[PDB]
Write a protein that binds this ligand. Structure first.
Ligand SMILES: Cc1ncc(COP(=O)(O)O)c(C/N=C(\CNc2ccccc2O)C(=O)O)c1O
Ligand SMILES: O=P(O)(O)OCCNS(=O)(=O)c1ccc(OC(F)(F)F)cc1
Ligand SMILES: Nc1ccccc1O
Ligand SMILES: [Cl-]
Ligand SMILES: [Cl-]
Ligand SMILES: [Cl-]
Ligand SMILES: [Cl-]
Ligand SMILES: [Cl-]
Ligand SMILES: [Cl-]
Ligand SMILES: [Cl-]
Ligand SMILES: [Cs+]
Ligand SMILES: [Cs+]
Lengths: 395, 268
């Protein structure tokens, strides 16, 4: 029994051990109550504006579209406190944790951006925060391990499996199943068991609401398409949500193509996996023929996840949203292009969305199109990884 | 078939509880796993709970995580697990055999086909660890259609509605969870389960087996005195496999002594 629909068509649900159902039901009830509570909404709004810095800018990127009929805007979640869109919904979930009387926070992280966001919100709001992070991601995203520990969070390296985001997710859930009376699991994406895909969307939807108002003010019309990278789904559904009923607006999600879809070393389950049950949800999975969950791959730790949130699987199934992939090398070019020609250093995750927008422009340069890319984070955490790659290329 | 019902009827006549070990199928290898399971039965196991190696066993702590890894290192597949189950049932016609599954392995090639294959090899029950009662309908329906007992979890935080559902929907045995958390011998249950055991009997639920953290004979006796029909022990068994990988002879000898002692605790 739930208050809200746990499914998006055939996708979603609550595939957790029985022990965790009271925790999910409590979270759902607290969310439904808080969404009706003017005091909660005002606290949340206060934090978003005066602490995180909302609304974020919408930047018109003129150099990189020169000589084409593409107009490209970047929604600047890289300017949010913490450096990524992850901060938005962490502030709301932390308020939910306090509303439920939890004193501790469990969080997974791969890009370390959700870990940093969870740690900063816990420091602000008086919660004891512990972060699970794959040992591989500890290294390739180390500037954030430094940030998290300075803010008082416990950071726990995970060496199991691929030593990346999937494995951190596993240990966060294992931990929560034995600590849920005192710890809230601050899941970092629009995936997992209900109610997380719903809560995370509603606590990210200001991205698209602001974008819509900003595009209308500057261009007098809706975008032709909005474009976002898809690791678990949160920045993309945050951008998409307010446009879903505007049927003229394309919704384009970009999965990581890794070394190339044909190599199997990618993170693109929505278009190249098949439906399965894992991480509390029925959703597209990278899996073996036998039903073992695969390991994913991406140059970008934040997209290195072998599943995807159920609302994206649904929006794809009905044709409302379209999903594509972008390889490591395509993402790296877009990263370089934004640094050099717009003076913005993007997260490698966000660079996948940018790369697809640049492809849309370059492939049809005389096509008139008004596009928005969700620039979900800044790239400071990536500058060392990008350095080592271009050095090994002789660049 | 009726293997659980016959077991508990025989156990009640002898006024004793069930001891049910768990191991991972194919840990540390197929043929060593088969000998391990024969040793568990010869030492007095009343029933078996058997795990199919899964890539991401999110209800399991480190001990059984590593059992899964060992089986994968031996290349063990679900198809080989069903081959093993056929060989076990061929040797042991009456012992109740329950599988510990994760949902994706049941869903993968069709839920109905999975339970049909369980029926063909002689499995008696299936517990799907990440399917709560709220999601259970296609699993329990497919189980019952193929004469498989669907095993439901009664957690310590169970309310009255959950007790009634688990009592109505389940067959074979009710899984009485000792505590929150994941599998593991290092962490023993804290709460008394007397109130839930008796509500389950009131609602005519399948007989209860307590599991999670049962590693000592006293715990087996205590579960039986509390009213449960028996107890399950996994990590304590698997630790003996892990500790004796280099000595399969001393592995089976120490498994035999442990199972014997745990079973003897169920007799009073
Ligand atoms: C700037 C930026 N942009 C986009 C993404 C992609 O995530 P999305 O917007 O949720 O699709 C990330 C993802 N980063 C993760 C992964 N977070 C994560 C991903 C998948 C499952 C669990 C997770 O914690 C993190 O933990 O910080 C990011 O940092
Ligand atoms: O002795 P321990 O602590 O290792 O426990 C052994 C339990 N092995 S099992 O197959 O019964 C078993 C039963 C239920 C499980 O998860 C669930 F409760 F969510 F369903 C996991 C394993
Ligand atoms: N559709 C739906 C709505 C509310 C609660 C449960 C549900 O399945
Ligand atoms: Cl309101
Ligand atoms: Cl409006
Ligand atoms: Cl369009
Ligand atoms: Cl008895
Ligand atoms: Cl694991
Ligand atoms: Cl390996
Ligand atoms: Cl615990
Ligand atoms: Cs232009
Ligand atoms: Cs992904």
């Amino acid at each position: 029994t739930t208050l809200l629909n746990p499914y998006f068509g055939e996708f979603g649900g609550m595939y957790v051990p029985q022990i965790l159902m009271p925790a999910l039901n409590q979270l759902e009830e607290a969310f439904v109550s808080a969404q009706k509570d003017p005091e909660f909404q005002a606290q949340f709004a206060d934090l978003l504006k005066n602490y995180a810095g909302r609304p974020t800018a919408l930047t018109k990127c003129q150099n990189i579209t020169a000589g084409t009929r593409t107009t490209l805007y970047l929604k600047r979640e890289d300017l949010l406190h913490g450096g990524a869109h992850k901060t938005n919904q962490v502030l709301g979930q932390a308020l939910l944790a306090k509303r439920m009387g939890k004193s501790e926070i469990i969080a997974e992280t791969g890009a370390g951006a959700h870990g940093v966001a969870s740690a900063l919100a816990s420091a602000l709001l008086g919660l004891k925060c512990r972060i699970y992070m794959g040992a591989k991601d500890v290294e390739r995203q180390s500037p954030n391990v430094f940030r998290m520990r300075l803010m008082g969070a416990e950071v726990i390296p995970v060496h199991s499996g691929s030593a990346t985001l999937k494995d951190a997710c596993n240990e966060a859930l294992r931990d929560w199943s034995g600590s849920y009376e005192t710890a809230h699991y601050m899941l970092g994406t629009a995936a997992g068991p209900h109610p997380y895909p719903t809560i995370v969307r509603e606590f990210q939807r200001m991205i698209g609401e602001e974008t819509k108002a900003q595009i209308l003010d500057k261009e007098g019309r809706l975008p032709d398409a909005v474009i976002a990278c898809v690791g678990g789904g949160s920045n993309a559904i945050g951008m998409f949500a307010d446009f879903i009923n505007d049927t003229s607006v394309g919704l384009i999600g970009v999965e990581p193509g890794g070394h190339g879809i044909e190599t199997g070393e990618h993170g693109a389950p929505l278009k190249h996996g098949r439906v399965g049950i894992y991480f509390g949800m029925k959703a597209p999975m990278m899996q073996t023929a036998d039903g073992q969950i695969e390991e994913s791959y991406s140059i970008s730790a934040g997209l290195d996840f072998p599943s995807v949130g159920p609302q994206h699987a649904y929006l794809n199934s009905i044709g409302r949203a379209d999903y594509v992939s972008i390889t490591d090398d395509e993402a790296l070019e877009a990263f370089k292009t934004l640094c050099r020609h717009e003076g913005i250093i993007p997260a490698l995750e966000s660079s996948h969305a940018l790369a697809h927008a640049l492809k849309m422009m370059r492939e049809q340069p005389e096509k008139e199109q008004l596009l928005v890319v969700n620039l979900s984070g800044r790239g400071d955490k990536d500058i060392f990884t990008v350095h080592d790659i271009l050095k090994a290329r002789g660049e | 078939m009726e293997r659980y019902e016959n077991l508990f009827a025989q156990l009640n006549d002898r006024r004793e509880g069930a001891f049910v070990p768990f191991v991972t199928l194919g840990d540390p290898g197929i043929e060593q796993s088969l000998k391990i399971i024969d040793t568990l039965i010869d030492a007095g196991a009343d029933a078996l709970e058997l795990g199919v190696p899964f890539s991401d066993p999110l209800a399991d702590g480190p001990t059984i995580q590593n059992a899964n890894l060992r089986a994968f290192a031996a290349g063990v597949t679900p198809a080989q697990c069903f081959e093993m189950l056929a060989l076990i049932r061929e040797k042991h016609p009456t012992i109740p055999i329950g599988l510990l599954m994760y949902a994706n392995l049941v869903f993968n090639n069709g839920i109905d086909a999975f339970y049909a294959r369980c029926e063909q090899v002689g499995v008696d029950s299936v517990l799907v660890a990440d399917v709560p009662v709220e999601e259970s309908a296609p699993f329990r329906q497919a189980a019952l259609r193929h004469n498989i007992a669907p095993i439901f979890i009664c957690p310590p935080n169970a309310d009255d509605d959950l007790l009634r559902q688990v009592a109505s929907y389940g067959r074979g045995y009710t899984y009485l969870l000792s505590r929150s958390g994941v599998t593991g011998a290092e962490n023993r249950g804290a709460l008394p389960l007397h109130h839930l055991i008796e509500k389950l009997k009131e609602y005519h639920a399948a007989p209860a087996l307590q599991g999670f953290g049962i590693s000592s004979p006293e715990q087996v006796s205590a579960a039986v005195r509390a009213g449960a029909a028996g107890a399950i022990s996994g990590s304590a068994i698997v630790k003996i496999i892990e500790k004796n990988l280099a000595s399969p002879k001393q592995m089976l000898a120490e498994l035999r002594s442990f199972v014997s002692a745990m079973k003897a605790a169920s007799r009073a």
